[PDB]
Structures are given as C-alpha cells and as structure tokens.
C-alpha cells in the first residue's frame, strides 16, 4: 500500500495464526510483538522499554504477514505496549519512505 | 527521495541555519532535536528518553529543511542521543510508506 502519516501507521499483521495490529516504525531496528503463543525454540534477550528494560524471547526465522505481505525474520516477543514492525522486517516486504 | 531501510534512514536537515543528521521515524509522533542555538520563545515539556524522562524546550512554527524539503512545525529541543523526525514533520513533506 501507500501509507500517509497523518495518523499512526497501524496495519494488520498475521503471526502464529493470529491477527494483531502493529505499528510500522522506520526508527526501530528490530520487531517487538506482545506476549503470545508460538511454537519453537527461542533465546532470551533484554531490550529497552517504557520504564526500563524488558525481557523478550528472540524467535528466528518466523513467518509473519504484514498487510498481506509475507516475510521471514526475527521477532522479539515480550510485554510491549505497542506491536512494532522494525526495519528487519520492513526490508523484507520492500518498504520505502518516499517524498 | 525514495529511501530503502537496509540501513537507518538518516538524512541531512537544516534547522537554525545548522546542518544536522536526523532519523526519519514513522513510529515517532513528534520531532526531537539535540540541544542547539535557536531564537524565539518556547515552552517547557518533558518526554520519555533513554534512562528516563528528558527535559525539552517546545518551539512552535520552526522552519526546518528535511533532505531539501521545507516544513513548518513544532520541534522539541533537548538532550536526545539521536535527532528524530517524527510524523508531525513527515506529513509536512508529503512522506509516505510504500510497499
């Protein structure tokens, strides 16, 4: 699609067979999704969050659909207030900033 | 321009007659720029930062050039580690996310 920025650029994603709302964030290097049911192995990581650090599970090679576009990449799963799609996955769907 | 996201989307901005590097961030509502010389009146605000809150000066009706495109809007000036161009100014230069 072509998304203007008058409102937050929120889209529907599909991950672990579940639909969620997520923010397309060009200022984020990585993707962080709220706690959820996923199968498979993961590695513990900590990242910055509101209030301080948060504990996440790093899942590699996750299939995610972002506004109907399928992508493979790493997803950090933990207690974030906003689902964030960062550049690691925006690059996989060919997303560009245009002006 | 059309900016891909393999690297951070850093561009040159011009503000208060000074060139700076800034991150184009669709996940940011507002624009935050490092401490600098500016003329004019301002209002004190606090926002979230790395480590905790930070103190900023809110300047309204600031002219800023973003990769050669001129925009008018509000800028928060304070001790940020990264200059961030948020949606308040991305909308003014007609920026879209495209995929």
């Amino acid at each position: 699609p072509q998304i203007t920025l008058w409102k937050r650029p929120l889209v529907t994603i599909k991950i672990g067979g579940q639909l969620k709302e997520a923010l397309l964030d060009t200022g984020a290097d990585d993707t962080v999704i709220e706690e959820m049911s996923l199968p498979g192995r993961w590695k513990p990581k900590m990242i910055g969050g509101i209030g301080g650090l948060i504990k996440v599970r790093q899942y590699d090679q996750i299939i995610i659909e972002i506004a109907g576009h399928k992508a493979i990449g790493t997803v950090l799963v933990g207690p974030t207030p906003v689902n964030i799609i960062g550049r690691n996955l925006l690059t996989q769907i060919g997303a560009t900033l245009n002006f």
Side-chain angles (χ1 to χ4, degrees), chain A residues 5-97:
Chain A
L5 298 170
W6 295 110
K7 52 208 45 151
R8 292 182 173 164
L10 297 171
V11 301
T12 304
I13 67 163
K14 180 160 208 71
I15 179 167
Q18 302 187 251
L19 301 185
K20 300 184 170 311
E21 177 179 79
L23 180 71
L24 303 184
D25 191 349
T26 60
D29 300 335
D30 305 307
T31 288
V32 193
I33 304 298
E34 60 189 50
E35 295 161 293
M36 56 181 295
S37 156
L38 302 165
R41 71 97 27 150
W42 52 268
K43 300 129 253 85
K45 297 297 154 91
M46 301 229 198
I47 62 174
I50 288 174
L53 289 192
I54 63 213
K55 224 33 239 246
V56 296
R57 293 186 292 249
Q58 180 183 310
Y59 293 86
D60 296 324
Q61 305 124 37
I62 292 310
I63 314 297
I64 182 165
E65 206 171 60
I66 303 162
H69 292 68
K70 247 167 149 182
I72 313 172
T74 295
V75 179
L76 307 175
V77 177
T80 178
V82 180
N83 299 318
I84 296 152
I85 309 307
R87 296 187 299 98
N88 84 121
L89 293 178
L90 298 169
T91 52
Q92 301 302 300
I93 64 184
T96 60
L97 262 184

Coordinates of all heavy atoms in Angstrom, one line a residue, chain A residues 5-97:
Chain A
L5 N 1.0 9.6 6.8 CA 1.4 9.6 8.2 C 0.6 10.6 9.1 O 1.1 11.0 10.2 CB 2.9 9.9 8.2 CG 3.7 8.8 7.5 CD1 5.2 9.3 7.4 CD2 3.6 7.5 8.3
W6 N -0.6 11.0 8.7 CA -1.5 11.8 9.5 C -1.9 11.2 10.8 O -2.0 11.8 11.8 CB -2.7 12.3 8.7 CG -2.3 13.2 7.5 CD1 -2.3 12.9 6.2 CD2 -1.7 14.5 7.6 NE1 -1.9 13.9 5.4 CE2 -1.5 14.9 6.2 CE3 -1.4 15.4 8.6 CZ2 -1.0 16.2 5.9 CZ3 -0.9 16.7 8.3 CH2 -0.7 17.0 6.9
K7 N -2.1 9.9 10.7 CA -2.3 9.0 11.9 C -1.1 8.0 12.0 O -0.3 7.9 11.0 CB -3.6 8.2 11.9 CG -3.8 7.4 10.6 CD -5.3 7.2 10.4 CE -6.1 8.5 10.5 NZ -7.3 8.6 9.7
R8 N -1.1 7.3 13.1 CA 0.0 6.3 13.3 C -0.2 5.3 12.2 O -1.3 4.9 11.9 CB -0.1 5.7 14.7 CG 0.2 6.6 15.8 CD 0.2 6.1 17.2 NE 0.7 7.0 18.2 CZ 0.6 7.0 19.5 NH1 -0.1 6.0 20.1 NH2 1.1 7.9 20.4
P9 N 0.9 4.8 11.6 CA 0.8 3.8 10.5 C 0.6 2.4 11.1 O 1.5 1.5 11.1 CB 2.1 4.0 9.8 CG 3.0 4.5 10.9 CD 2.2 5.4 11.7
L10 N -0.6 2.1 11.5 CA -1.0 0.9 12.1 C -1.6 0.0 11.0 O -2.4 0.4 10.2 CB -2.0 1.1 13.2 CG -1.6 1.9 14.4 CD1 -2.8 2.2 15.3 CD2 -0.6 1.1 15.2
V11 N -1.2 -1.3 10.9 CA -1.7 -2.2 9.9 C -2.0 -3.5 10.7 O -1.5 -3.8 11.8 CB -0.6 -2.5 8.8 CG1 -0.2 -1.3 8.0 CG2 0.6 -3.2 9.4
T12 N -2.7 -4.4 10.0 CA -2.9 -5.8 10.5 C -1.8 -6.7 10.1 O -1.3 -6.7 8.9 CB -4.2 -6.3 9.9 OG1 -5.3 -5.4 10.3 CG2 -4.5 -7.7 10.5
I13 N -1.3 -7.4 11.0 CA -0.3 -8.5 10.8 C -0.9 -9.8 11.2 O -1.9 -9.9 12.0 CB 1.0 -8.2 11.6 CG1 0.8 -8.3 13.2 CG2 1.6 -6.9 11.3 CD1 2.0 -8.5 14.0
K14 N -0.3 -10.9 10.7 CA -0.7 -12.2 11.0 C 0.6 -12.9 11.5 O 1.6 -13.0 10.7 CB -1.3 -13.0 9.8 CG -1.7 -14.4 10.2 CD -2.8 -15.0 9.3 CE -3.6 -16.0 10.0 NZ -4.5 -15.4 11.0
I15 N 0.6 -13.5 12.7 CA 1.8 -14.1 13.3 C 1.2 -15.2 14.2 O 0.3 -15.0 15.0 CB 2.7 -13.2 14.0 CG1 3.9 -13.8 14.7 CG2 1.9 -12.4 15.1 CD1 4.9 -12.9 15.2
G16 N 1.8 -16.4 14.1 CA 1.4 -17.6 14.9 C -0.1 -17.8 14.7 O -0.8 -18.3 15.6
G17 N -0.7 -17.5 13.5 CA -2.0 -17.8 13.1 C -3.0 -16.8 13.6 O -4.2 -17.0 13.5
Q18 N -2.5 -15.7 14.2 CA -3.3 -14.7 15.0 C -3.2 -13.4 14.3 O -2.1 -13.0 13.8 CB -2.8 -14.6 16.4 CG -2.8 -15.9 17.2 CD -2.5 -15.7 18.7 OE1 -1.5 -16.1 19.2 NE2 -3.4 -15.1 19.4
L19 N -4.3 -12.6 14.2 CA -4.3 -11.3 13.7 C -4.0 -10.3 14.8 O -4.7 -10.3 15.9 CB -5.6 -10.9 13.0 CG -6.0 -11.7 11.8 CD1 -7.3 -11.1 11.2 CD2 -4.9 -11.8 10.8
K20 N -3.1 -9.4 14.6 CA -2.8 -8.3 15.5 C -2.6 -7.0 14.8 O -2.4 -7.0 13.6 CB -1.5 -8.6 16.3 CG -1.5 -9.9 17.1 CD -0.3 -10.1 17.9 CE -0.4 -11.3 18.9 NZ -1.7 -11.2 19.8
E21 N -2.7 -5.9 15.6 CA -2.4 -4.6 15.0 C -1.0 -4.2 15.3 O -0.5 -4.4 16.5 CB -3.4 -3.5 15.6 CG -3.2 -2.1 15.2 CD -4.2 -1.2 15.8 OE1 -4.0 -0.8 17.0 OE2 -5.2 -0.8 15.1
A22 N -0.2 -3.7 14.4 CA 1.1 -3.3 14.6 C 1.5 -2.0 13.9 O 0.9 -1.6 12.9 CB 2.1 -4.4 14.2
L23 N 2.5 -1.3 14.5 CA 3.0 0.0 14.0 C 4.1 -0.2 13.1 O 5.1 -0.9 13.5 CB 3.4 0.8 15.2 CG 3.9 2.2 15.0 CD1 2.8 3.1 14.5 CD2 4.6 2.7 16.3
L24 N 4.1 0.3 11.9 CA 5.3 0.3 11.0 C 6.2 1.4 11.4 O 5.9 2.6 11.2 CB 4.8 0.4 9.6 CG 3.8 -0.6 9.1 CD1 3.5 -0.5 7.6 CD2 4.3 -2.0 9.3
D25 N 7.4 1.0 11.9 CA 8.3 2.0 12.6 C 9.7 2.0 11.9 O 10.6 1.2 12.2 CB 8.4 1.6 14.0 CG 9.1 2.6 14.9 OD1 9.7 3.5 14.3 OD2 9.0 2.5 16.2
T26 N 10.0 2.9 11.1 CA 11.3 3.1 10.4 C 12.4 3.4 11.4 O 13.5 3.3 11.0 CB 11.2 4.1 9.3 OG1 10.9 5.4 9.7 CG2 10.1 3.7 8.2
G27 N 12.1 4.0 12.5 CA 13.1 4.3 13.5 C 13.4 3.1 14.4 O 14.3 3.2 15.3
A28 N 12.8 2.0 14.3 CA 13.1 0.8 15.0 C 14.0 -0.2 14.2 O 13.7 -0.5 13.1 CB 11.8 0.0 15.4
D29 N 15.1 -0.7 14.7 CA 15.9 -1.6 14.0 C 15.3 -3.0 14.0 O 15.4 -3.7 13.0 CB 17.3 -1.8 14.7 CG 18.1 -0.5 14.8 OD1 17.9 0.4 14.0 OD2 18.9 -0.5 15.8
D30 N 14.5 -3.4 15.0 CA 14.1 -4.7 15.3 C 12.5 -4.7 15.5 O 11.9 -3.6 15.6 CB 14.8 -5.3 16.4 CG 16.3 -5.3 16.4 OD1 16.9 -5.8 15.4 OD2 16.9 -4.8 17.3
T31 N 12.0 -5.9 15.5 CA 10.5 -6.0 15.6 C 10.2 -6.6 17.0 O 10.8 -7.6 17.3 CB 10.0 -7.0 14.5 OG1 10.1 -6.2 13.2 CG2 8.6 -7.4 14.7
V32 N 9.2 -6.0 17.7 CA 8.8 -6.4 19.0 C 7.3 -6.6 19.0 O 6.6 -5.7 18.7 CB 9.3 -5.4 20.1 CG1 9.1 -6.1 21.5 CG2 10.7 -4.9 19.9
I33 N 6.8 -7.8 19.4 CA 5.4 -8.2 19.5 C 5.1 -8.6 20.9 O 5.9 -9.2 21.5 CB 5.2 -9.3 18.4 CG1 5.6 -9.0 17.0 CG2 3.7 -9.8 18.5 CD1 4.9 -7.9 16.4
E34 N 3.8 -8.3 21.3 CA 3.3 -8.7 22.6 C 3.4 -10.2 22.8 O 3.5 -11.0 21.9 CB 1.9 -8.2 22.7 CG 1.0 -8.8 21.6 CD -0.4 -8.2 21.6 OE1 -0.7 -7.0 21.5 OE2 -1.3 -9.1 21.6
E35 N 3.4 -10.5 24.1 CA 3.4 -11.9 24.5 C 2.3 -12.7 23.8 O 1.1 -12.3 23.7 CB 3.3 -12.1 26.0 CG 4.5 -11.5 26.8 CD 4.3 -11.2 28.3 OE1 3.5 -10.3 28.7 OE2 4.9 -11.9 29.1
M36 N 2.7 -13.9 23.3 CA 1.7 -14.7 22.6 C 2.3 -16.1 22.5 O 3.4 -16.3 22.8 CB 1.5 -14.3 21.1 CG 2.9 -14.2 20.4 SD 2.6 -13.7 18.7 CE 1.6 -15.0 18.0
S37 N 1.4 -17.0 22.2 CA 1.6 -18.4 21.8 C 2.4 -18.5 20.5 O 1.9 -18.1 19.5 CB 0.2 -19.1 21.8 OG -0.1 -20.3 21.1
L38 N 3.6 -19.1 20.6 CA 4.3 -19.5 19.4 C 5.1 -20.8 19.7 O 5.6 -21.2 20.8 CB 5.4 -18.5 19.0 CG 5.0 -17.1 18.6 CD1 6.1 -16.1 18.6 CD2 4.2 -17.1 17.3
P39 N 5.2 -21.6 18.6 CA 5.9 -22.9 18.7 C 7.4 -22.7 18.5 O 7.8 -21.7 17.9 CB 5.3 -23.6 17.6 CG 5.0 -22.6 16.6 CD 4.5 -21.4 17.3
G40 N 8.3 -23.6 18.9 CA 9.7 -23.5 18.5 C 10.6 -22.9 19.6 O 10.1 -22.5 20.7
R41 N 11.9 -23.0 19.3 CA 12.9 -22.6 20.2 C 13.2 -21.1 20.2 O 12.9 -20.5 19.1 CB 14.2 -23.3 19.9 CG 14.9 -22.8 18.6 CD 16.0 -21.8 18.7 NE 16.9 -21.7 19.9 CZ 18.1 -21.3 20.0 NH1 18.9 -21.0 19.0 NH2 18.6 -21.3 21.2
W42 N 13.7 -20.6 21.3 CA 14.0 -19.1 21.3 C 15.2 -18.8 22.3 O 15.5 -19.8 23.0 CB 12.7 -18.4 21.9 CG 12.1 -18.9 23.2 CD1 11.1 -19.8 23.3 CD2 12.5 -18.5 24.5 NE1 10.9 -20.0 24.6 CE2 11.7 -19.2 25.4 CE3 13.5 -17.6 25.0 CZ2 11.8 -19.1 26.7 CZ3 13.6 -17.5 26.4 CH2 12.8 -18.2 27.2
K43 N 15.7 -17.6 22.2 CA 16.8 -17.2 23.0 C 16.4 -16.0 23.9 O 15.8 -15.1 23.4 CB 18.0 -16.9 22.2 CG 18.6 -18.0 21.3 CD 18.7 -17.6 19.9 CE 17.7 -18.2 19.0 NZ 16.4 -17.5 18.8
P44 N 16.8 -16.0 25.1 CA 16.4 -14.8 26.0 C 17.2 -13.6 25.6 O 18.4 -13.7 25.4 CB 16.8 -15.2 27.4 CG 17.9 -16.3 27.2 CD 17.6 -17.0 25.9
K45 N 16.6 -12.4 25.5 CA 17.2 -11.1 25.3 C 16.6 -10.1 26.2 O 15.5 -10.3 26.7 CB 17.2 -10.6 23.9 CG 17.9 -11.5 22.8 CD 19.4 -11.6 23.0 CE 20.0 -12.8 22.4 NZ 20.4 -12.7 21.0
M46 N 17.2 -9.0 26.4 CA 16.6 -7.8 27.1 C 16.7 -6.6 26.1 O 17.8 -6.5 25.5 CB 17.4 -7.5 28.4 CG 17.4 -8.6 29.4 SD 16.9 -8.1 31.0 CE 17.5 -9.4 32.1
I47 N 15.7 -5.8 26.1 CA 15.8 -4.5 25.3 C 15.2 -3.4 26.1 O 14.5 -3.6 27.1 CB 15.0 -4.7 24.0 CG1 13.5 -5.0 24.2 CG2 15.6 -5.8 23.1 CD1 12.7 -5.1 23.0
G48 N 15.4 -2.2 25.6 CA 14.8 -1.0 26.3 C 13.3 -1.0 26.1 O 12.8 -1.3 25.0
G49 N 12.6 -0.6 27.2 CA 11.2 -0.4 27.2 C 10.8 0.8 27.9 O 11.6 1.5 28.5
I50 N 9.5 1.1 27.9 CA 9.0 2.2 28.7 C 9.2 1.8 30.2 O 8.8 0.7 30.6 CB 7.5 2.5 28.5 CG1 7.1 3.1 27.1 CG2 6.9 3.3 29.6 CD1 5.6 3.1 26.9
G51 N 9.9 2.7 30.9 CA 10.0 2.4 32.4 C 11.3 1.8 32.7 O 11.8 1.9 33.9
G52 N 11.9 1.1 31.8 CA 13.1 0.4 31.9 C 13.3 -0.8 30.9 O 12.7 -0.8 29.8
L53 N 14.1 -1.7 31.3 CA 14.3 -2.8 30.4 C 13.2 -3.8 30.3 O 12.4 -4.1 31.3 CB 15.6 -3.5 30.9 CG 16.9 -2.9 30.7 CD1 18.0 -3.9 31.0 CD2 17.1 -2.2 29.4
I54 N 13.0 -4.5 29.1 CA 12.1 -5.6 29.2 C 12.7 -6.9 28.7 O 13.6 -6.9 27.8 CB 10.8 -5.3 28.4 CG1 11.0 -5.0 26.9 CG2 10.2 -4.0 29.1 CD1 10.0 -4.0 26.4
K55 N 12.2 -7.9 29.2 CA 12.6 -9.3 28.8 C 11.8 -9.8 27.6 O 10.6 -9.7 27.6 CB 12.4 -10.2 30.0 CG 13.4 -11.2 30.4 CD 14.9 -11.0 30.2 CE 15.6 -12.1 29.3 NZ 16.5 -12.8 30.2
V56 N 12.5 -10.2 26.6 CA 11.9 -10.8 25.4 C 12.5 -12.1 25.1 O 13.6 -12.5 25.5 CB 12.0 -9.8 24.2 CG1 11.3 -8.5 24.5 CG2 13.5 -9.5 23.9
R57 N 11.7 -12.8 24.3 CA 12.1 -14.1 23.7 C 12.5 -13.8 22.2 O 11.6 -13.3 21.5 CB 11.0 -15.1 23.8 CG 10.7 -15.6 25.2 CD 9.7 -16.7 25.1 NE 8.4 -16.2 24.7 CZ 7.2 -16.1 25.3 NH1 7.1 -16.4 26.6 NH2 6.2 -15.6 24.6
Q58 N 13.7 -14.2 21.8 CA 14.0 -13.9 20.4 C 13.7 -15.2 19.6 O 14.4 -16.2 19.8 CB 15.5 -13.6 20.2 CG 16.0 -13.3 18.8 CD 17.4 -13.0 18.7 OE1 17.9 -12.2 19.4 NE2 18.1 -13.7 17.8
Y59 N 12.8 -15.1 18.7 CA 12.5 -16.1 17.7 C 13.1 -15.8 16.3 O 12.8 -14.8 15.8 CB 11.0 -16.4 17.6 CG 10.3 -16.9 18.8 CD1 9.8 -16.1 19.9 CD2 10.0 -18.3 18.9 CE1 9.1 -16.6 20.9 CE2 9.3 -18.7 20.0 CZ 8.9 -17.9 21.0 OH 8.2 -18.4 22.1
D60 N 13.8 -16.8 15.8 CA 14.4 -16.6 14.4 C 13.5 -17.3 13.4 O 12.9 -18.3 13.7 CB 15.8 -17.1 14.5 CG 16.7 -16.2 15.4 OD1 16.5 -15.0 15.5 OD2 17.6 -16.8 16.1
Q61 N 13.6 -16.8 12.2 CA 13.0 -17.5 11.0 C 11.5 -17.6 11.2 O 11.0 -18.7 10.9 CB 13.7 -18.8 10.8 CG 15.2 -18.7 10.6 CD 16.1 -19.6 11.5 OE1 15.9 -20.7 11.9 NE2 17.2 -19.0 11.9
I62 N 10.8 -16.6 11.7 CA 9.4 -16.6 11.9 C 8.7 -16.0 10.7 O 9.2 -15.1 10.1 CB 9.0 -15.7 13.1 CG1 9.4 -16.3 14.5 CG2 7.5 -15.3 13.2 CD1 9.0 -17.8 14.7
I63 N 7.7 -16.7 10.2 CA 6.9 -16.2 9.1 C 5.8 -15.3 9.7 O 5.1 -15.5 10.7 CB 6.2 -17.4 8.4 CG1 7.1 -18.5 8.1 CG2 5.5 -16.9 7.1 CD1 8.2 -18.1 7.1
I64 N 5.8 -14.1 9.1 CA 4.8 -13.1 9.5 C 4.2 -12.4 8.3 O 4.9 -12.2 7.3 CB 5.5 -12.0 10.4 CG1 4.7 -10.8 10.9 CG2 6.7 -11.5 9.5 CD1 5.4 -10.1 12.0
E65 N 2.9 -12.1 8.3 CA 2.3 -11.4 7.2 C 2.1 -10.0 7.6 O 1.5 -9.8 8.7 CB 1.1 -12.1 6.7 CG 0.6 -12.0 5.3 CD -0.5 -13.0 5.1 OE1 -1.6 -12.8 5.8 OE2 -0.3 -13.9 4.2
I66 N 2.5 -9.0 6.8 CA 2.4 -7.6 7.2 C 1.5 -7.0 6.1 O 2.0 -6.9 5.0 CB 3.8 -6.9 7.3 CG1 4.7 -7.7 8.4 CG2 3.6 -5.5 7.7 CD1 6.1 -7.3 8.2
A67 N 0.3 -6.6 6.5 CA -0.6 -6.1 5.5 C -0.6 -6.9 4.2 O -0.6 -6.4 3.1 CB -0.3 -4.7 5.1
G68 N -0.6 -8.3 4.4 CA -0.8 -9.2 3.3 C 0.5 -9.6 2.6 O 0.5 -10.4 1.7
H69 N 1.6 -9.0 3.1 CA 2.9 -9.4 2.5 C 3.7 -10.3 3.5 O 3.9 -9.9 4.6 CB 3.7 -8.1 2.2 CG 3.2 -7.3 1.1 ND1 2.0 -6.5 1.2 CD2 3.7 -7.0 -0.1 CE1 1.9 -5.9 0.0 NE2 2.9 -6.2 -0.8
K70 N 4.1 -11.4 3.0 CA 4.8 -12.4 3.8 C 6.3 -12.1 3.9 O 6.9 -11.8 2.9 CB 4.5 -13.8 3.2 CG 3.7 -14.7 4.1 CD 3.1 -15.9 3.5 CE 3.0 -17.0 4.6 NZ 2.5 -18.3 3.9
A71 N 6.8 -12.3 5.1 CA 8.2 -12.0 5.4 C 8.6 -13.1 6.4 O 7.8 -13.7 7.2 CB 8.3 -10.6 6.0
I72 N 9.9 -13.3 6.3 CA 10.7 -14.2 7.2 C 11.7 -13.3 8.0 O 12.4 -12.5 7.4 CB 11.5 -15.3 6.5 CG1 10.7 -16.0 5.5 CG2 12.0 -16.2 7.6 CD1 11.6 -17.0 4.7
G73 N 11.7 -13.4 9.3 CA 12.8 -12.8 10.0 C 12.6 -13.0 11.5 O 11.9 -13.9 12.0
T74 N 13.5 -12.3 12.2 CA 13.5 -12.4 13.7 C 12.5 -11.6 14.4 O 12.3 -10.4 14.0 CB 14.9 -12.0 14.2 OG1 15.8 -13.0 13.6 CG2 15.0 -12.0 15.7
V75 N 11.8 -12.1 15.4 CA 10.8 -11.4 16.1 C 11.1 -11.5 17.6 O 11.5 -12.6 18.0 CB 9.4 -11.9 15.8 CG1 8.3 -11.1 16.6 CG2 9.1 -11.7 14.3
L76 N 11.1 -10.4 18.3 CA 11.2 -10.4 19.7 C 9.9 -10.3 20.4 O 9.0 -9.5 20.0 CB 12.1 -9.1 20.2 CG 13.4 -9.0 19.5 CD1 14.1 -7.6 19.9 CD2 14.3 -10.1 19.8
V77 N 9.6 -11.3 21.2 CA 8.3 -11.4 21.8 C 8.4 -11.1 23.3 O 9.1 -11.8 24.1 CB 7.7 -12.8 21.6 CG1 6.3 -13.0 22.3 CG2 7.6 -13.1 20.1
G78 N 7.6 -10.2 23.8 CA 7.6 -9.8 25.1 C 6.6 -8.7 25.4 O 5.8 -8.3 24.5
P79 N 6.6 -8.2 26.6 CA 5.5 -7.3 27.1 C 5.7 -5.8 26.6 O 5.9 -4.9 27.5 CB 5.6 -7.4 28.6 CG 7.0 -7.7 28.9 CD 7.4 -8.7 27.8
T80 N 5.4 -5.6 25.4 CA 5.5 -4.3 24.8 C 4.0 -3.7 24.7 O 3.1 -4.5 24.5 CB 6.1 -4.3 23.4 OG1 6.1 -3.0 22.8 CG2 5.3 -5.2 22.4
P81 N 3.9 -2.4 24.9 CA 2.6 -1.8 24.9 C 2.0 -1.6 23.4 O 0.9 -1.4 23.2 CB 2.8 -0.4 25.5 CG 4.2 -0.1 25.2 CD 4.9 -1.5 25.4
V82 N 2.9 -1.7 22.4 CA 2.6 -1.5 21.0 C 3.4 -2.5 20.3 O 4.6 -2.7 20.6 CB 3.1 0.0 20.6 CG1 2.8 0.2 19.1 CG2 2.4 1.0 21.4
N83 N 2.8 -3.2 19.4 CA 3.5 -4.1 18.5 C 4.2 -3.3 17.4 O 3.6 -2.4 16.8 CB 2.5 -5.1 17.8 CG 1.8 -6.0 18.8 OD1 2.4 -6.5 19.7 ND2 0.5 -6.1 18.6
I84 N 5.5 -3.5 17.3 CA 6.4 -2.6 16.4 C 7.0 -3.5 15.3 O 7.7 -4.5 15.6 CB 7.5 -2.0 17.3 CG1 6.9 -1.0 18.3 CG2 8.5 -1.4 16.4 CD1 7.7 -0.8 19.6
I85 N 6.8 -3.1 14.1 CA 7.5 -3.7 13.0 C 8.6 -2.8 12.6 O 8.4 -1.7 12.1 CB 6.5 -3.9 11.8 CG1 5.2 -4.6 12.1 CG2 7.3 -4.6 10.6 CD1 5.5 -6.0 12.8
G86 N 9.8 -3.3 12.8 CA 11.0 -2.6 12.6 C 11.7 -2.9 11.2 O 11.1 -3.7 10.4
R87 N 12.8 -2.3 11.0 CA 13.4 -2.4 9.7 C 13.8 -3.8 9.3 O 13.8 -4.1 8.1 CB 14.7 -1.5 9.6 CG 14.4 0.0 9.7 CD 15.6 0.9 9.5 NE 16.7 0.6 10.4 CZ 17.7 -0.1 10.2 NH1 18.0 -0.8 9.1 NH2 18.6 -0.3 11.3
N88 N 14.1 -4.6 10.2 CA 14.4 -6.0 9.9 C 13.4 -6.7 9.1 O 13.7 -7.6 8.3 CB 14.8 -6.9 11.1 CG 13.7 -7.5 11.9 OD1 13.4 -8.6 12.2 ND2 13.0 -6.5 12.4
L89 N 12.1 -6.3 9.4 CA 11.0 -6.9 8.5 C 10.5 -5.9 7.5 O 10.1 -6.4 6.4 CB 9.8 -7.4 9.4 CG 10.1 -8.6 10.3 CD1 8.9 -8.9 11.2 CD2 10.5 -9.8 9.5
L90 N 10.6 -4.6 7.7 CA 10.2 -3.7 6.6 C 11.0 -3.9 5.4 O 10.5 -3.8 4.3 CB 10.2 -2.3 7.1 CG 9.3 -1.9 8.3 CD1 9.7 -0.5 8.8 CD2 7.9 -1.9 7.9
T91 N 12.3 -4.3 5.5 CA 13.1 -4.5 4.3 C 12.6 -5.7 3.6 O 12.8 -5.8 2.3 CB 14.6 -4.7 4.7 OG1 14.7 -5.7 5.7 CG2 15.3 -3.5 5.2
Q92 N 12.1 -6.7 4.3 CA 11.7 -8.0 3.7 C 10.4 -7.8 2.8 O 10.2 -8.7 1.9 CB 11.4 -9.0 4.7 CG 12.6 -9.3 5.6 CD 13.8 -9.8 4.7 OE1 13.7 -10.8 4.1 NE2 14.9 -9.0 4.8
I93 N 9.6 -6.8 3.1 CA 8.4 -6.5 2.3 C 8.7 -5.4 1.3 O 7.7 -4.9 0.6 CB 7.2 -6.2 3.1 CG1 7.3 -4.9 4.0 CG2 6.9 -7.4 4.0 CD1 6.1 -4.7 4.9
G94 N 9.9 -4.9 1.2 CA 10.3 -3.9 0.1 C 9.8 -2.5 0.5 O 9.6 -1.7 -0.4
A95 N 9.6 -2.2 1.8 CA 9.1 -0.9 2.2 C 10.1 0.2 2.0 O 11.2 0.0 2.4 CB 8.7 -0.9 3.7
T96 N 9.6 1.3 1.5 CA 10.4 2.5 1.3 C 9.6 3.7 1.9 O 8.4 3.7 1.9 CB 10.7 2.8 -0.2 OG1 9.5 2.9 -0.9 CG2 11.4 1.6 -0.7
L97 N 10.4 4.7 2.3 CA 10.0 6.0 2.6 C 10.1 6.9 1.4 O 11.2 6.9 0.9 CB 10.8 6.6 3.7 CG 10.2 6.5 5.1 CD1 11.2 7.3 6.0 CD2 8.8 7.1 5.3

